Design an enzyme around this catalytic site. Sequence first.
Site, PDB file in Angstrom:
ATOM      1  CG  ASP A 166      -3.368   3.749   5.536  1.00 46.18           C
ATOM      2  OD1 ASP A 166      -3.090   4.547   6.455  1.00 46.18           O
ATOM      3  OD2 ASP A 166      -4.349   3.891   4.774  1.00 46.18           O
ATOM      4  CB  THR A 220      -2.754   2.907  -5.317  1.00 45.71           C
ATOM      5  OG1 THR A 220      -3.434   3.022  -4.052  1.00 45.71           O
ATOM      6  CG2 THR A 220      -2.942   4.189  -6.098  1.00 45.71           C
ATOM      7  CE  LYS A 228      -2.775   5.048  -1.551  1.00 47.56           C
ATOM      8  NZ  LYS A 228      -4.072   4.951  -2.312  1.00 47.56           N
ATOM      9  CG  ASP A 262      -2.217   0.841   1.012  1.00 50.68           C
ATOM     10  OD1 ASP A 262      -2.437   1.388  -0.092  1.00 50.68           O
ATOM     11  OD2 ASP A 262      -3.009   0.948   1.981  1.00 50.68           O
ATOM     12  CG  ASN A 301      -1.577   5.090   2.089  1.00 51.34           C
ATOM     13  OD1 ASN A 301      -2.447   5.966   2.111  1.00 51.34           O
ATOM     14  ND2 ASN A 301      -1.808   3.862   1.640  1.00 51.34           N
TER      15      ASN A 301
HETATM   16  O1  LIG Z   1      -3.686  10.845   7.988  1.00 54.07           O
HETATM   17  S1  LIG Z   1      -4.578   9.805   8.391  1.00 54.07           S
HETATM   18  O2  LIG Z   1      -5.952  10.105   8.646  1.00 54.07           O
HETATM   19  C1  LIG Z   1      -3.897   9.026   9.825  1.00 54.07           C
HETATM   20  C2  LIG Z   1      -4.030   7.666   9.914  1.00 54.07           C
HETATM   21  C3  LIG Z   1      -3.409   6.966  10.934  1.00 54.07           C
HETATM   22  C4  LIG Z   1      -2.651   7.616  11.865  1.00 54.07           C
HETATM   23  C5  LIG Z   1      -2.502   9.024  11.824  1.00 54.07           C
HETATM   24  C6  LIG Z   1      -1.726   9.752  12.754  1.00 54.07           C
HETATM   25  N1  LIG Z   1      -1.597  11.070  12.746  1.00 54.07           N
HETATM   26  C7  LIG Z   1      -2.248  11.751  11.787  1.00 54.07           C
HETATM   27  C8  LIG Z   1      -3.010  11.169  10.818  1.00 54.07           C
HETATM   28  C9  LIG Z   1      -3.154   9.761  10.803  1.00 54.07           C
HETATM   29  N2  LIG Z   1      -4.557   8.682   7.209  1.00 54.07           N
HETATM   30  C10 LIG Z   1      -5.790   7.964   6.833  1.00 54.07           C
HETATM   31  C11 LIG Z   1      -5.929   7.782   5.328  1.00 54.07           C
HETATM   32  C12 LIG Z   1      -4.752   7.099   4.676  1.00 54.07           C
HETATM   33  N3  LIG Z   1      -3.597   7.939   4.349  1.00 54.07           N
HETATM   34  C13 LIG Z   1      -2.845   8.538   5.445  1.00 54.07           C
HETATM   35  C14 LIG Z   1      -3.275   8.075   6.796  1.00 54.07           C
END
Ligand SMILES: O=S(=O)(c1cccc2cnccc12)N1CCCNCC1
Lengths: 350, 18
Positions: A184, A201, A168, A166, A171
């Site tokens: 992710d 993707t 990219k 995954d 992520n």
């Molecule tokens: O930024 S998030 O909401 C996020 C996820 C998990 C942990 C995180 C920690 N801090 C900020 C944002 C975070 N995110 C969800 C969609 C997939 N792409 C990037 C990760």
Amino acid sequence: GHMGNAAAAKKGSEQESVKEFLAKAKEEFLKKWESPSQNTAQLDHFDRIKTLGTGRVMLVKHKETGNHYAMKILDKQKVVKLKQIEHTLNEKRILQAVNFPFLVKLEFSFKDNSNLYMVMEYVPGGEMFSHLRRIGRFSEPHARFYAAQIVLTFEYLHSLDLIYRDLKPENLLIDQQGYIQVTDFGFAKRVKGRTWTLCGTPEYLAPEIILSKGYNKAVDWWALGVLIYEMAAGYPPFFADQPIQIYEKIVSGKVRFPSHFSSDLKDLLRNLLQVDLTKRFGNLKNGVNDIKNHKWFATTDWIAIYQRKVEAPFIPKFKGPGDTSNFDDYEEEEIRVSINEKCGKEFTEF
Amino acid sequence: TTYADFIASGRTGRRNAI
Ligand SMILES: O=S(=O)(c1cccc2cnccc12)N1CCCNCC1
């Protein structure tokens, strides 16, 4: 040869130290893999602040400690509808078992009648995607700093028989020190031989994922090639209006490079974006060392990267705790917990 | 240019998994 006695002895010792570290890392992982953690908090311990991304991830604040976290909220009925049960349970199981400086840390997890909750550390710098699109492209030293952390992270994950699948810029998050955090694991799989799932993707898929043949961990090294290309060029090596056209280009493998790419970079990328699995770096007898020892990484001190002692090229602006200015804005749906428990049997292990 | 083609592709924003 390319190395005199001193440099040869040093490199051989470093590579044996990696083996020693991964043997211990795997013993640690497998202990937690077999005996996972569960239900280490509950919903009313946190105030919901703002949606960081879309289930949905929200910035929350621990009522007792005042610490901020990112809480991922999964709707149990939605996960069932999308046939995502196994994916969700496996993501939580992986995140609670791994441990590496560039892998996001799961601090708490719990469930209620409607939802599953994973509470992770808050990574305040936003997605790499945002900063890449904002400045267009990264200079090669900048791109290499991020790439080295991905190389070490995949070396770690692959030693645990985990395929990531995954990768990219969307992520990859940037922390307050400028280092990368991988978050992710909905598509990761623990598998020693081959696997077949069509997932990922389009721009980042290896040819052998697209085609019906089985594939192995080497798809992640293809995806690293795509990531490094996109970081250094500002766009990916294979794109088109529709995913079907993208796949056709990927399978042809004819890759072209911007004229500002260094020769070292093009050589690395030709060996990562290699359709022939018998020739792809990361898949040969020498393993990850073909990548780590490539000339494009000659200035990379791998221990210092791991120890986070290298100065980062970009430090996010943090205007204080709970600042979300490095994230986009999303519409705020209220969290609803049913009177009745949904899909209890399916999510016993969470 | 390749960049202009990328802009024209419409896949310059966040990309979803398949
Ligand atoms: O930024 S998030 O909401 C996020 C996820 C998990 C942990 C995180 C920690 N801090 C900020 C944002 C975070 N995110 C969800 C969609 C997939 N792409 C990037 C990760």
